């Protein structure tokens, strides 16, 4: 079976320009586990990105946390790019500090 990923993009701490924080991309409810996830800064891929150990929910659907240290600003745009077999095209989800 195949399940399309849910995607949340969010900072570990309340976002404040000029203050170091962690940018999270939380992908879940997907299957199979094969998945490509990148964090983007103004369209470019961030290199030093970590992720958690693959795990899963009650319905066997997988979940992962991708994250990187970063410093919010006014002009810098951040996003999470997720590619999965269920997606006809890589999905790009822009970070929204209010969510």
């Amino acid at each position: 079976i195949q399940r399309t990923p849910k995607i949340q993009v969010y900072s570990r701490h309340p976002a404040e320009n000029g203050k170091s924080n962690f940018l999270n991309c939380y992908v879940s409810g997907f299957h199979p586990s094969d998945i490509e996830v990148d964090l983007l800064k103004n369209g470019e891929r961030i290199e030093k990105v970590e992720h958690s150990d693959l795990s899963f929910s009650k319905d066997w659907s997988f979940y992962l946390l991708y994250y990187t240290e970063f410093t919010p600003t006014e002009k810098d745009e951040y996003a999470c790019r997720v590619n999965h077999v269920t997606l006809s095209q890589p999905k790009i989800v822009k970070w929204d500090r209010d969510m």
């Binding site: 079976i1 399940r3 849910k6 949340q8 969010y10 570990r12 962690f22 999270n24 939380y26 879940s28 409810g29 299957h31 199979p32 586990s33 094969d34 958690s52 150990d53 693959l54 795990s55 899963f56 066997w60 659907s61 997988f62 946390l65 994250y67 209010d98 969510m99």
Partner: protein, 274 residues
């Protein structure tokens, strides 16, 4: 209150070249404490919580040999189940297993469980009495008979009611500074005008542990679900969790609405008002 120890395994065949990806994670309640990833350099069971690092080399040797042994079982089973289902060797397939035990507040056995899946669907599971198996289909039924002829369930029961509970008590004691501590949710509410007439109120729960939480909007004392949104609980990345719930309301009427937060870390539920 009650606690649990759980392990999650995932194996994924790779027909292009080489052997399956195997990943194991162990939790006590909502805290990950060990991991093994076949793609990792160590090829060891690795620590992921400070309180497990005190275990001696023996602990690490046993657990490492055993997860590796289990990864090899998964490799075999991937091949067998491909056969049971008459599938081509060109396809990648997945086996997952979650097992664990629960204890109560007094540290007494509460329940045990061990279920597995193939390609994201139930395959075989241990019944609640830990004596027999539930097979989801005729492939699993083939396994069930074989396992009942070998009394696999007995070893699982002996572990789930015995070994599993004992180590769970041990970890809970060694890591009591964190494992037996609740972090209540830190709450607050934000107000996003959508127009001159409507606004979205968002109720935040942050930095809480454990992950289980109830967030509800009330309007004049009664629960509301219309015009509400409720994101999945998510990891902050530091061991704690986050969640929020929101409602669209008519501007000026904000004070009618209350957010209600239930959590183990809260002796009495919280109610927030704008």
């Amino acid at each position: 209150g009650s606690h649990s120890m759980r392990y999650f395994y995932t194996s994924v065949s790779r027909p292009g070249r080489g052997e399956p990806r195997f990943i194991a994670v162990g939790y006590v309640d909502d805290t990950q404490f060990v991991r093994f990833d076949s793609d990792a350099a160590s090829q060891r069971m690795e620590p992921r919580a400070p309180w497990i690092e005190q275990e001696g080399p023996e602990y690490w040797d046993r657990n490492t040999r055993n997860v590796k042994a289990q990864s090899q079982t998964d490799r075999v089973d991937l091949g067998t189940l491909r056969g049971y289902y008459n599938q081509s060797e060109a396809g990648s397939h997945t086996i997952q297993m979650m097992y664990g035990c629960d204890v109560g507040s007094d540290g007494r056995f509460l329940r045990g469980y061990r279920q597995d899946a193939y390609d994201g669907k139930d395959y075989i599971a241990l019944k609640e009495d830990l004596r027999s198996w539930t097979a989801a289909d005729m492939a699993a039924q083939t396994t069930k008979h074989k396992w009942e002829a070998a009394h696999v369930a007995e070893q699982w029961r002996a572990y789930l009611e015995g070994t599993c509970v004992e180590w769970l008590r041990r970890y809970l004691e060694n890591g009591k500074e964190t494992l037996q501590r609740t972090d209540a949710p830190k709450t607050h509410m934000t107000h996003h005008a959508v127009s001159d007439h409507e606004a979205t109120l968002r109720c935040w729960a942050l930095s809480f542990y454990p992950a289980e939480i109830t967030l509800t909007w009330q309007r004049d004392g009664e629960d509301q679900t219309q015009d509400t949104e409720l994101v999945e609980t998510r990891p902050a990345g530091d061991g704690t969790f986050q969640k929020w719930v929101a409602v669209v309301v008519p501007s000026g009427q904000e004070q009618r609405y209350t957010c209600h937060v239930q959590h183990e870390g809260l002796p009495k539920p919280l109610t927030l008002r704008w």
